[PDB]
Design an enzyme around this catalytic site. Structure first.
Site, PDB file in Angstrom:
ATOM      1  N   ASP A 266       2.516   2.111   8.173  1.00  0.00           N
ATOM      2  CA  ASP A 266       1.353   1.660   7.580  1.00  0.00           C
ATOM      3  C   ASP A 266       1.094   0.097   7.276  1.00  0.00           C
ATOM      4  O   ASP A 266       0.850   0.846   5.450  1.00  0.00           O
ATOM      5  CB  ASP A 266      -0.219   2.315   7.105  1.00  0.00           C
TER       6      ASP A 266
ATOM      7  N   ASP B 223       0.573  -1.032  -0.110  1.00  0.00           N
ATOM      8  CA  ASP B 223       0.343   0.355   0.407  1.00  0.00           C
ATOM      9  C   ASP B 223       1.359   1.340  -0.417  1.00  0.00           C
ATOM     10  O   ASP B 223       0.489   1.966   1.257  1.00  0.00           O
ATOM     11  CB  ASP B 223      -1.009   0.048   1.187  1.00  0.00           C
TER      12      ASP B 223
ATOM     13  N   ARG C  77      -0.530   9.364   1.148  1.00  0.00           N
ATOM     14  CA  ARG C  77      -1.094   8.947   1.959  1.00  0.00           C
ATOM     15  C   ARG C  77      -0.255   7.944   3.643  1.00  0.00           C
ATOM     16  O   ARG C  77      -0.929   8.721   4.887  1.00  0.00           O
ATOM     17  CB  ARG C  77      -2.827   8.452   1.706  1.00  0.00           C
ATOM     18  N   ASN C  78       0.776   7.523   3.327  1.00  0.00           N
ATOM     19  CA  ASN C  78       0.773   6.580   3.584  1.00  0.00           C
ATOM     20  C   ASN C  78       2.637   6.941   4.199  1.00  0.00           C
ATOM     21  O   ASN C  78       3.199   6.189   4.287  1.00  0.00           O
ATOM     22  CB  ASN C  78       0.815   4.984   3.508  1.00  0.00           C
TER      23      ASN C  78
HETATM   24  C1  LIG Z   1      -3.882  21.979   7.692  1.00  0.00           C
HETATM   25  C2  LIG Z   1      -3.050  19.900   7.715  1.00  0.00           C
HETATM   26  N1  LIG Z   1      -3.844  19.217   9.177  1.00  0.00           N
HETATM   27  C3  LIG Z   1      -3.214  18.947  10.038  1.00  0.00           C
HETATM   28  C4  LIG Z   1      -2.114  18.471   9.941  1.00  0.00           C
HETATM   29  N2  LIG Z   1      -1.629  17.043   9.680  1.00  0.00           N
HETATM   30  C5  LIG Z   1      -2.913  16.312  11.108  1.00  0.00           C
HETATM   31  C6  LIG Z   1      -2.287  15.234  10.964  1.00  0.00           C
HETATM   32  C7  LIG Z   1      -1.612  15.167  12.146  1.00  0.00           C
HETATM   33  C8  LIG Z   1       0.120  13.896  12.125  1.00  0.00           C
HETATM   34  C9  LIG Z   1      -0.769  13.012  11.937  1.00  0.00           C
HETATM   35  C10 LIG Z   1       0.056  11.567  11.968  1.00  0.00           C
HETATM   36  C11 LIG Z   1      -0.244  10.173  11.556  1.00  0.00           C
HETATM   37  C12 LIG Z   1       0.381   9.819  12.067  1.00  0.00           C
HETATM   38  C13 LIG Z   1       0.428   7.919  12.052  1.00  0.00           C
HETATM   39  N3  LIG Z   1      -0.090   7.669  11.723  1.00  0.00           N
HETATM   40  C14 LIG Z   1      -0.194   6.198  11.264  1.00  0.00           C
HETATM   41  C15 LIG Z   1      -1.082   5.475  10.798  1.00  0.00           C
HETATM   42  C16 LIG Z   1       0.457   4.768  12.147  1.00  0.00           C
HETATM   43  C17 LIG Z   1       0.924   3.220  12.710  1.00  0.00           C
HETATM   44  C18 LIG Z   1       0.561   3.145  13.306  1.00  0.00           C
HETATM   45  C19 LIG Z   1      -0.143   3.221  14.397  1.00  0.00           C
HETATM   46  C20 LIG Z   1      -0.776   4.592  14.643  1.00  0.00           C
HETATM   47  C21 LIG Z   1      -0.844   5.126  13.649  1.00  0.00           C
HETATM   48  N4  LIG Z   1       1.921   7.634  11.839  1.00  0.00           N
HETATM   49  C22 LIG Z   1       2.327   8.418  13.543  1.00  0.00           C
HETATM   50  N5  LIG Z   1       2.713   9.513  13.556  1.00  0.00           N
HETATM   51  C23 LIG Z   1       1.381  10.372  13.168  1.00  0.00           C
HETATM   52  N6  LIG Z   1       0.965  11.124  12.652  1.00  0.00           N
HETATM   53  C24 LIG Z   1      -1.615  12.734  10.832  1.00  0.00           C
HETATM   54  C25 LIG Z   1      -1.912  13.850  10.621  1.00  0.00           C
HETATM   55  C26 LIG Z   1      -2.302  17.630   8.699  1.00  0.00           C
HETATM   56  C27 LIG Z   1      -3.908  18.038   8.419  1.00  0.00           C
END
Ligand SMILES: CCN1CCN(Cc2ccc(-c3cc4c(N[C@H](C)c5ccccc5)ncnc4[nH]3)cc2)CC1
Length: 303
Positions: A160, A142, A146-147
């Site tokens: 992810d 994937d 987005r990932n």
């Molecule tokens: C105008 C911009 N707006 C606010 C700022 N960001 C929001 C945002 C901030 C951080 C994250 C973020 C997701 C994330 C994340 N998610 C993945 C899918 C994940 C993987 C394993 C376990 C938990 C999550 N993992 C680690 N750090 C992360 N940070 C996602 C969206 C973009 C949208």
């Protein structure tokens, strides 16, 4: 593949961390922004928690531990490592917060300050990351903007692996069931006969860089995700991004070859984009390049 593995799977209780606000929602569980204060030491490391929906079968419970296994076992600057796991009826996966969110979101926002040096650096890193996952028999399944998450604008990481799958001793591929999958990111074989190899991921890489070169565009917009394989078999493909040099597009094109074996290999892609990284304004033409910033190259983790 012979050394002692020795990864530390840290198990944590739901008191050690509290969820501050949600970041992602979906049937693919909920993912929150939170803080993790490890039992003892007086530090509050900011994390991402993914509390995926309740398991509905013992078979589809064994796979969760599997996603946790690898995510916990990887060790690369450009791949996300599992920080801990919380084993409650609803399993929760804890991971170092990447505060800037995903790259797809980042490029859309600052789509006016991003210059060529950054774009090409991101391509490189993403390929360093994937090549890593290749030297581990791992098949992402994937890859999309987005990932790809932004630790700092100069440093991104892949994440992810909901679909990630190890390859056995003698195995050149992986055959899937019938879960959900993002047809607009898949190689033709994947859409055809659910085949997933490293070369299948390469096709995804190309769509990803396409995404970046276009500052967030939706691939094949408006075109319903049902007849993708037609147009694909027909020989159509995403258009050359306005800012994109033939030299760069031509790599995205090689990435989308019906013949898996004619697509680049991450190993090659690195060196190619790395070469392009030096002297970037030769390969990406963006109005205002002379202007755009360059990367001169309560308590965060790494503790
Ligand atoms: C105008 C911009 N707006 C606010 C700022 N960001 C929001 C945002 C901030 C951080 C994250 C973020 C997701 C994330 C994340 N998610 C993945 C899918 C994940 C993987 C394993 C376990 C938990 C999550 N993992 C680690 N750090 C992360 N940070 C996602 C969206 C973009 C949208």
């Amino acid at each position: 593949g012979e050394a002692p593995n020795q990864a530390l799977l840290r198990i944590l209780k739901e008191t050690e961390f509290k969820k501050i606000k949600v970041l992602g929602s979906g049937a693919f569980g909920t993912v929150y922004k939170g803080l993790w204060i490890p039992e003892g030491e007086k530090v509050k490391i900011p994390v991402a928690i993914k509390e995926l929906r309740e398991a509905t079968s013992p078979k589809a419970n064994k796979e969760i531990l599997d996603e946790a296994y690898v995510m916990a076992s990887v060790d690369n600057p450009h791949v996300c490592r599992l920080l801990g796991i919380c084993l409650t009826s609803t399993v929760q996966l804890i991971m170092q917060l990447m505060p800037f969110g995903c790259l797809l979101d980042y490029v859309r926002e600052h789509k006016d300050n991003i210059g060529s040096q950054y774009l090409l650096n991101w391509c490189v890193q993403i390929a360093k990351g994937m090549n890593y996952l290749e030297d581990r028999r791992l098949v992402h399944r994937d890859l999309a903007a987005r990932n790809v998450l932004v630790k700092t604008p100069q440093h991104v990481k892949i994440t992810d692996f909901g679909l990630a799958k190890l390859l056995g001793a003698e195995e050149k591929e992986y055959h899937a069931e019938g879960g959900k999958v993002p047809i607009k990111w898949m190689a033709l074989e994947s859409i055809l006969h659910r085949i997933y190899t490293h070369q299948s991921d390469v096709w995804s890489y190309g769509v990803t860089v396409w995404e970046l070169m276009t500052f967030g565009s939706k691939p094949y917009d408006g075109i319903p995700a049902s007849e993708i394989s037609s147009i694909l078999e027909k020989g159509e493909r995403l258009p050359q991004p306005p800012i994109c040099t033939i030299d760069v597009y031509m790599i995205m094109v090689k990435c989308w070859m019906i013949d898996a074996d004619s697509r680049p290999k991450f190993r090659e892609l690195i060196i190619e984009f790395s070469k392009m990284a030096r002297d970037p304004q030769r390969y990406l033409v963006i109005q205002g390049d002379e202007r755009m910033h360059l990367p001169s190259p309560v308590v965060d983790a790494d503790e």
